[PDB]
Design a protein around this nucleic acid. Structure first.
Lengths: 209, 209, 209, 209
RNA sequence: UUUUUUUUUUUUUUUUUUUUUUUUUUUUUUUUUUUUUUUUUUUUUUUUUUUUUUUUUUUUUUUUUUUUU
């Protein structure tokens, strides 16, 4: 048995370590392209990582959607605003994929300072689940993401994971209900409609048990 | 591991404090532009904050919609009416974003005086939930908003947060049902219709469990 | 990359401010020519702007067509009638282009006094949309127009914009149906006809959804 | 397998980069001919690009039709008016093709300053879609156009693309309804008619879903 | 009786905005109209399913009063 029919024997399992890569997280080729754009717009390379952690922490208070307006300037750039840092990222990967890379860093930072995501109440989270009230919360246990050196202070509880999956259903289905099913945006197909659906037909509910 | 691949070590989590910024709350650049317009229409800078807190407290009795008619004059301007203060705000940010900034102030003010939002019964709130009967109630636990020095008297209960989310569904869906799906307001698309929908097709219900 | 192939870098977007100019609004060269004619027919230069705002406010009660008869004299001229002020304007630009320049001023003036355009019922407007019942209502959000210092009291609602676009369809199509398609007004082409069309063939309808 | 039957192997896909060219965007031969005319009418070559970006930004407030009257003079020429710059462009390519080349620049400029196209309300756009209210908005994601160095602040949303396609239908069909089907402009064919169509037969509607 | 295989499990989409006011009266509730006739036959095949056509251009301005009931 050779070629693709080779049977592994036990030397492979004890020695080989798979480097984990994920397509929901910004790749190593993605992150090298961010650095080349960021250093060309004069982000200091001595605080390049802290400018990323500050941007993703701000992206836990607001969304990580491509339409999200970043607000202010962090203290680790040379006055480069967070909107300009995020616009450089969206040329390479999505903002959500970049934020998934730093999700354990932001999770530890929020749990150290006891500072939840800012709009947890507007998102409909209960106060006992408010630390899961950011998108890209799925990346906190993804091994392709940046894990801090001493690990997570606290893993996410099962109730926090439950609340995040429910909120992910509500936010994504509401965003799809504001979109359409039109396969083309030409007026021959859309007939000048945004959703192609009335207000009552677009109401999202999670059906009861 | 350097650049964007730097692993945080624990010095960062104990020292760095993220200044919280939110795009649902009026920004610091927004508020500086309000002050320049307000002092030019001769609002006293010694009571500039109290004129804002009086306007947002009045915006808890009426809406914070852009179409809302402000009624009277507060005691902290130099006779500048609340409609003129709100019209200056709507040149910079939304009125709702300005009111979200002062939501914990208005929440403490209403709980101190035992004075709920004025039209809580018309909004369909039960009497035990009537203190949540304002829009921009989501901002009372947003850390980007102005928190008073000694804190909230009482946090919002879970039942108050439940009632506010339900009322937010009813008021927003009713406002969308009076709007249309028309992608253009030209008569070639609207065909001279406001909603493009009959009265029976526009009825909003929250489907039962 | 130089010449017309130069890539903008971010210094341009933060520093350069485009002065907005519109060809639907009376230009700065247009308005300087109005002043030279108005001061030569002895309009007081101390109330030159108020004579314009009074004329455009009167042009919200009647049309801004070139055929419109202006009625009376405002209080800010030296007894110069509004028909003589409008005849001087029509030598330079259209009356509608002049009125578009002052559309936010007239919009604020009408909303302050609760005084809608005078013939809103004859125009077929519903009472809840009657403040949009003037032509040149499109200019109220045009940034080339004169914006008052503290801003609009209320922006136009979506239903008001819908009603204005529908009324613009009806009034313009009815005016075209009283015109012709004749490419020349010589009797060899027109054959002594005004519209070249019967009464039944000239009926305007907005086709139903 | 050689000649036109050669099978690509994977070296071609990893190495070759196609330079994108579009016939809806002004070509590199087009732009070199603009520069030769612009420098001969003494446009400064140190601000040749900024004079183009100022002209296209003004062409987002007014149209990019060949019949469009440009209004004023930008600050980056040596007093050369925008009408003279546009007349030089129309000798080489269309004004719309030139403006498509700088559509991401104008898109970033408008989103930085929060300054929409000036006549968005007259075009029938809803306020939530008003940043798409220019023609040549199709060029903002065309890779043949000039992309700024740090990228777009925000990509166009799906609802903005929907509104632009609907407005493109309405404006182009209305312009065709004012034209004719006559195959020749000689009076033997046109019979002295502009459209060859009555007013009621020329009404444009987008048929309802 | 037949129907129980395979395929389909990735990404993307989670921001903002929208929550005011107005609209809640009156009128409209009778009578008439309910039968008969019409239900069959015929018509179910063949042929027609390829290519071609998808670019560009066209999106500004002007026209919205009065009169006519």
């Amino acid at each position: 048995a050779s070629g693709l029919f080779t049977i592994p024997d036990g030397d492979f399992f004890s020695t080989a370590r798979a480097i984990v890569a994920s397509n929901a997280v910004a790749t190593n080729e993605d992150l090298s392209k961010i650095e080349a754009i960021w250093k060309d717009m004069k982000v200091p390379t001595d605080t390049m990582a802290q400018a990323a952690w500050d941007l993703v922490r701000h992206c836990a208070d607001v969304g990580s959607s491509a339409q999200t307006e970043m607000i202010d300037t962090g203290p680790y750039s040379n006055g480069i605003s967070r909107a300009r840092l995020a616009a450089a990222i969206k040329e390479v990967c999505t903002l959500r994929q970049f934020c998934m890379k730093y999700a354990p860093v932001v999770w530890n930072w929020m749990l150290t300072n006891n500072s939840p995501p800012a709009n947890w109440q507007a998102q409909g989270f209960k106060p006992e689940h408010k630390f899961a009230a950011f998108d890209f919360f799925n990346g906190v246990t993804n091994p392709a993401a940046i894990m801090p050196k001493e690990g997570l202070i606290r893993p996410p509880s099962e109730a926090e994971m439950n609340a995040a999956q429910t909120a992910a259903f509500v936010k994504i289905t509401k965003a799809r209900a504001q979109s359409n099913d039109f396969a083309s945006l030409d007026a021959a197909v859309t007939r000048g409609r945004i959703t192609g659906t009335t207000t009552a037909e677009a109401v999202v509910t999670l059906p009861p048990p």
